[PDB]
């Protein structure tokens, strides 16, 4: 069972029970089992939201090559039906529905096998075989074997976490999207590199939204 | 076993973990005697409860003072209350010392004799001024909602929360005092100034806290 580096011995709590186990815990954060279950759920959440974000930024840049996702959150940079919208009501919709689904998944973590049923229509229920893997209506095509697909899912999610923070970091550095930065590196690879572009954040310093000013931050003191 | 304030060192012998907030913090050994430690437990609780009460007063008055509601800042509030109303200063001082000396002397002689203030000598009241622990006087008056007699483990949890929030408010009140002594401003003004420039508006820019 290849590990994260040659010669390194995996810890005693890392065995192969979880998918994508390379024995890599140099801080010993998964030494407690309940904390390890919580960080596995957090890994699944960050992995799936980052895969959605990478596929997002990819398609948004391909289909409409004038978005520049770093500016896409503004009210002016919005699609054709909703393009001058009150952001308060949008955040209200998001807060209510996300607080609902999030509290459902949190109670799944707290009590495994207790929020499977639909509370309104009581003849509906998802069978979750593992924690973090609901199934049922969440698996409509139903390809689930399961272990190798979970390894594919966690490797893709780790790669997409690294790639999304790459997108954010690069986009703060040179002010361009990922495909535009790829075309800039393919134009000349020696000029327009990381050796030149870093040190200058393209963060536009507290954009005034409709009523308020958000403080904007760069991950490094570039300015 | 239990978490100590200073990891690696063992706790002292007189701090066992029976007390709420018992982290073994006694480097000057001020409480080796059990009676002196009992007295200091009650002094810690009284200072903590006054600091929580005063710190919530500071925070609410400063929230009302930054937004234009006309509230004073807390270093001017006593002057503008005595001058806005027709209140004379020394009569309100003496009435405060009357009421506070009554209540505090009842607490004092209940520390000296640990069940004695529930003899019915005060107006007719009995077992409503009997204490429960040192510094924990819960009856019908001081604990009207009745949380110290059901779910005793949850009551120990509330004791821990009370001591932690009290130490936090004591260092917060010391913060308000020293913070105003350096900056000369209200505390949430200083909070807004820290949120404006965190890297440049802080205690290493006053010229007071580090004079180098």
């Amino acid at each position: 069972r290849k590990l994260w580096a040659p010669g390194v011995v995996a810890p005693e709590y890392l065995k192969g029970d979880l998918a994508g186990d390379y024995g890599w815990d140099p801080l010993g954060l998964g030494a407690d089992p309940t904390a390890l279950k919580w960080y596995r759920q957090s890994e699944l959440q960050h992995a799936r939201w980052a895969m959605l974000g990478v596929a997002g930024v990819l398609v948004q840049e391909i289909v409409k090559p004038d978005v520049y996702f770093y500016e896409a959150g503004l009210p002016q940079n919005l699609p054709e039906p909703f393009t001058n919208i009150n952001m308060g009501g949008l955040l209200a919709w998001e807060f209510i529905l996300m607080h609902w689904v999030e509290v459902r998944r949190w109670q799944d973590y707290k009590n495994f096998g207790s929020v499977n049923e639909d509370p309104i229509f009581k003849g509906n229920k998802v069978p979750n075989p593992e924690m973090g893997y609901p199934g049922g209506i969440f698996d409509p095509f139903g390809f689930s074997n399961l272990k190798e697909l979970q390894t594919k899912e966690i490797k893709n999610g780790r790669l997409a976490m690294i790639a999304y923070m790459a997108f954010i970091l690069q986009a703060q550095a040179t002010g361009k999207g990922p495909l535009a930065a790829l075309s800039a590196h393919l134009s000349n690879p020696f000029g327009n590199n990381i050796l030149k572009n870093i040190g200058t954040c393209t963060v536009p310093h507290s954009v005034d939204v409709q009523g308020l000013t958000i403080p904007l931050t760069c991950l490094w003191p570039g300015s | 076993v239990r978490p100590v304030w200073f990891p690696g060192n063992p706790p002292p012998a007189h701090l066992d973990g029976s007390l709420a907030g018992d982290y073994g913090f006694d480097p000057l050994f001020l409480g080796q005697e059990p009676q002196t430690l009992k007295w200091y437990v009650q002094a810690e609780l009284v200072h903590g409860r006054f600091a929580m009460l005063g710190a919530a007063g500071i925070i609410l008055t400063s929230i009302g003072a930054k937004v234009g509601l006309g509230f004073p800042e807390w270093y001017d509030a006593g002057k503008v209350v005595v001058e806005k109303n027709n209140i004379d200063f020394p009569t309100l001082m003496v009435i405060q010392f009357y009421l506070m000396g009554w209540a505090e002397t009842k607490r004092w002689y209940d520390f000296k004799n640990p069940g004695s203030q529930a003899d019915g000598s005060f107006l007719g009241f009995t077992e409503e001024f009997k204490g429960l622990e040192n510094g924990y006087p819960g009856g019908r008056f001081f604990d009207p909602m009745g949380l110290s007699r059901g779910d005793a483990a949850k009551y120990q949890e509330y004791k821990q929360k009370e001591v932690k929030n009290g130490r936090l408010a004591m260092i917060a009140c010391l913060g308000f005092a020293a913070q105003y002594a350096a900056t000369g401003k209200g505390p949430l003004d200083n909070l807004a100034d820290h949120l404006a420039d965190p890297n440049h508006v802080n205690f290493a820019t006053n010229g007071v806290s580090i004079p180098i």
Binding site: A5, P26, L27, P221 | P7, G8, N9, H200
Partner: protein, 202 residues
């Protein structure tokens, strides 16, 4: 024992009638702590000059090492994200945590693996030996699996460290006397080895 070449002319590793901070347990451990801080000091005092020489970092940086803000009389770089005292309080808190937990494992061996430190307790279980904790982070890769390989790596750490300590003392004396950086002293000694020495700069 690592680096035991017998060079002790003033006799300070004598176990008989020893005490205080002059003990083999304190002296060997402080020797490797000074060695590691001086390796980091030597690399850090060279690296801006050679990265400005190679043209990798810009000319706003690449300043001499004593002009960083260590000695504001000797020069100070403005362009950090804060004032150096705002940096220095973060340094106080951070180094207080690090150095102080390291002190507690020296005085009480193994004591840093019991009390809760956000799950970071198996990382700091240490060994039955100071100066070489190991574990999952201080020795990430299993390097020194053979005991003889471990002794050889400890000896190489000792020798590279003592060389770096001599180098940092040289950076200090060179920085005071000629007023320039150490890579500038490399360029001036390699250009004219006869006419640019300590005998010239008097």
């Amino acid at each position: 024992l690592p680096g035991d070449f017998g060079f002790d002319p003033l006799g300070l590793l004598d176990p008989v009638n020893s005490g205080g901070f002059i003990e083999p347990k304190w002296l060997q451990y402080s020797e490797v702590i000074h060695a590691r801080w001086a390796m980091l000091g030597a690399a850090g005092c060279i690296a801006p000059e050679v990265l400005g020489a190679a043209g990798l970092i810009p000319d706003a940086t690449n300043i001499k090492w004593f002009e960083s803000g260590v000695i504001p009389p000797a020069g100070s770089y403005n362009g950090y994200w804060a004032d150096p005292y705002t940096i220095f309080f973060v340094e106080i808190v951070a180094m207080q945590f690090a150095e102080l937990r390291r002190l507690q494992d020296f005085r009480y061996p193994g004591s840093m693996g019991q009390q809760y430190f956000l799950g970071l307790e198996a990382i700091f279980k240490g060994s039955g030996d100071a100066a070489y904790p190991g574990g999952p982070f201080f020795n990430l890769f299993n390097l020194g699996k053979t005991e003889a390989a471990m002794k050889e790596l400890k000896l190489k750490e000792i020798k590279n460290g003592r060389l770096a300590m001599l180098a940092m003392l040289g950076y200090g004396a060179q920085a005071v006397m000629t007023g320039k950086g150490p890579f500038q002293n490399l360029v001036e000694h390699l250009a004219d080895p006869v006419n640019n020495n300590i005998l010239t700069n008097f």
